[PDB]
Amino acid sequence: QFEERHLKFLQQLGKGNFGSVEMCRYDPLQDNTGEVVAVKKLQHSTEEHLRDFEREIEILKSLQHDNIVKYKGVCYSAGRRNLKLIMEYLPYGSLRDYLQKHKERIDHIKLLQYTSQICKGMEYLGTKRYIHRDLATRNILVENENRVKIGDFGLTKVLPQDKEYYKVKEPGESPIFWYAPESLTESKFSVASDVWSFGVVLYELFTYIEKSKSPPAEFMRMIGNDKQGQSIVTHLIELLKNNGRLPRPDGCPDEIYMIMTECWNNNVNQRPSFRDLALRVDQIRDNMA
Numbered sequence: 001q002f003e004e005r006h007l008k009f010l011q012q013l014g015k016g017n018f019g020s021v022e023m024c025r026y027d028p029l030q031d032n033t034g035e036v037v038a039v040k041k042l043q044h045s046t047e048e049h050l051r052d053f054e055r056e057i058e059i060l061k062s063l064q065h066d067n068i069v070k071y072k073g074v075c076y077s078a079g080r081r082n083l084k085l086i087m088e089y090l091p092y093g094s095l096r097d098y099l100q101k102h103k104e105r106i107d108h109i110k111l112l113q114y115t116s117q118i119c120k121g122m123e124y125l126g127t128k129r130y131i132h133r134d135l136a137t138r139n140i141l142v143e144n145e146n147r148v149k150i151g152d153f154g155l156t157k158v159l160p161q162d163k164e165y166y167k168v169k170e171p172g173e174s175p176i177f178w179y180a181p182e183s184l185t186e187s188k189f190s191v192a193s194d195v196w197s198f199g200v201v202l203y204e205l206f207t208y209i210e211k212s213k214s215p216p217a218e219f220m221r222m223i224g225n226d227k228q229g230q231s232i233v234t235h236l237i238e239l240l241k242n243n244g245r246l247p248r249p250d251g252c253p254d255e256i257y258m259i260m261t262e263c264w265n266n267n268v269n270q271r272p273s274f275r276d277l278a279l280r281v282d283q284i285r286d287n288m289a
């Protein structure tokens with residue numbers, strides 16, 4: 001158990017789904033020798049978001065994989081309504097920030113190593129019947145130059161026993177530029193819609209997070225920058241239905257763009273599996289190395 005009185009605030013790490021992440025030192029000996037941890041807390045500790053946060057905690061606790069952020073514990077000290085989630089602190093930050101800082105200094109071999117690691121964490125997630133729903137480089141963390149881990153399980157849903165999809169009745173904030181067409185039209189999330197988002201993550205990696213090339217900038221340019229609010233969703237659905245897709249990033253290998261376009265299939269059943277994606281990406285890495 002982690003006592004709040006010993007959790008020393010060090011710095012703000014960012015905002016996750018429905019909360020804030022802080023870098024803290026868990027220092028029970030009060031000599032500044034304690035472990036540095038990442039702590040998620042709720043900004044608005046309501047009954048609905050406390051229920052989702054408790055589910056996120058249970059989901060993360062059940063996951064043990066090299067490419068999934070490690071759960072460490074929970075801090076109850078501030079009562080049952082003010083829970084804190086304690087996770088390992090990944091010192092190189094989000095993959096989005098890491099790539100935007102180093103750009104083309106991260107070679108293609110290195111990008112494919114991270115791609116393979118993302119596939120493996122996601123494939124492991126699917127064996128548990130969890131649908132991440134928010135796969136993006138902003139939610140992927142860098143442990144060191146050789147390892148990335150999937151983070152932010154805030155939107156993660158568990159598939160019902162008798163269904164291959166989860167229908168979200170009243171959506172909250174939704175990362176629509178990473179969404180599969182059926183997630184936009186019917187609010188249906190499955191392993192197949194996570195594969196669609198994975199194709200978007202692969203696109204983010206090979207654009208090196210060049211601002212004007214981001215999935216929102218590119219899709220807005222395709223539907224027209226004059227579209228606003230709900231109209232964006234309406235026009236994005238029509239664009240995807242008519243095979244409007246993100247372009248091939250400048251300098252991206254043909255083989256890598258072929259994977260992205262296969263992930264972006266309107267037919268749910270034709271999208272590749274994460275097992276097949278990790279095998280294909282590993283073969284590509286082997287053909288390069």
Ligand SMILES: CCc1cc(O)c(F)cc1-c1cc(N[C@@H](C)CO)c2nc(N)ncc2c1
Binds near residue numbers: 088092094138141151
């Ligand atoms: C949103 C909190 C959270 C919840 C989860 O369910 C989860 F699996 C991971 C995280 C999380 C998130 C961070 N940063 C966020 C700002 C980027 O999305 C972390 N940043 C660093 N450097 N280290 C570890 C971090 C762990």
